[PDB]
């Protein structure tokens, strides 16, 4: 039965490598610099960034702050398809009621986005467009209200999350645990969701004990980060509402709005 | 073999996403139309009195032709939203230039709507209100001009298209092929779209061979139907230009207005 959890851990790792092109391992090599990304530290470097590197997130289709915000949304929609593909590789997931599969992804993708975004962040900035770019924390903070404090909470979360020093093999199982949450609203058959998560939690616990034997109660500490993630998502939703209500320059092509709803 | 295996995985992925995106499948539509059951029986609207009773029996301007026309607008906007949700699930679609995403949906959505409207149709009429209702082909043709001419060419297409006997698993890949069309006016990067469609076309070819082994050149026959769809759009566009001018008191939903703005 111990061999079964190690097999599940390996399976999830291999699937995570297939689904997510920019791994934490690769992201960290770039951030520390064991290899070079184009740095966006102000408006002039942003302009040169667009011009030279052609970020599909920033492509013209207007105020810089809004074009950065909309770039974040375009990337978020990309990430949802990578996560959806990963979810299908989790043993039991495809066998669930199809409405429940949709429900788990609907409520799970935000938590997963901010988990995996930590992998691309240090205290100084964030890797963008598959590690070709590095946007500074200070530059994001300098954006006019309310866009100035849109990324800052993610940075504060990331710095603390990154202190757990998890690797891709740890994260693969943690992300699977997040997807198989039996407390999501509107679920029809909670039992086989909790049975799969119970199995993933067992796999995650062995993985952290074998991978991080010196790291006392790392399992407990990682599960506590669920609190930090759900608060980040609740907080982010509350910022979207403020934006939709008080900003008059957010409008895109109506089909564009539908895609990136 | 490994090549085949990847195309079956893609087929399975697209069918799963199709069931998740489209609440009323062909399988459910046929079960309602073939009227075998006691629980799935639709209320049938064939005249003005039947329509007026339908208003109560089913859960949804004054003039009858207009109420139907604007009801059809609301549903068409809802279908656009479902098709947009489906498009995002097509591997590679959300990774394309954002302008090309908008362009592919702009030209793709109505071709898909008419393809999928075939599923809700037999030679005698069309399912409405998530299959709770059935509106007869005769009632729709009897409507004051030019409103009587909107649905007839859709029915004509549907009776021919339905003779191919496609199921939802076939249709999931076919509508994917329609969206990823490299020949849409004003596409910026044609190559990556063609590369996705080539893989989708390989997936469709295998799907039809395995699912319809006795159906000779079904692949070729299905691809030729994309000619009929383009044709339905052209006629529809011309018919809307007439309404715009004759009914100055009537409003076209902004999303549809945008889709048709500078179309061809």
Author numbering:
A (entry chain B): 207 to 241, 245 to 270, 275 to 474
B (entry chain A): 205 to 264, 274 to 477
Could you share sentences copied from the article?
The nuclear receptor PPARγ is a pivotal transcription factor regulating mammalian adipogenesis and adipocyte functions. The protein kinase CDK5 can phosphorylate the serine (Ser) 245 residue of PPARγ. The phosphorylated PPARγ at Ser245 is associated with the down-regulation of insulin-sensitizing adiponectin production. Butyrolactone I functions as a PPARγ partial agonist.
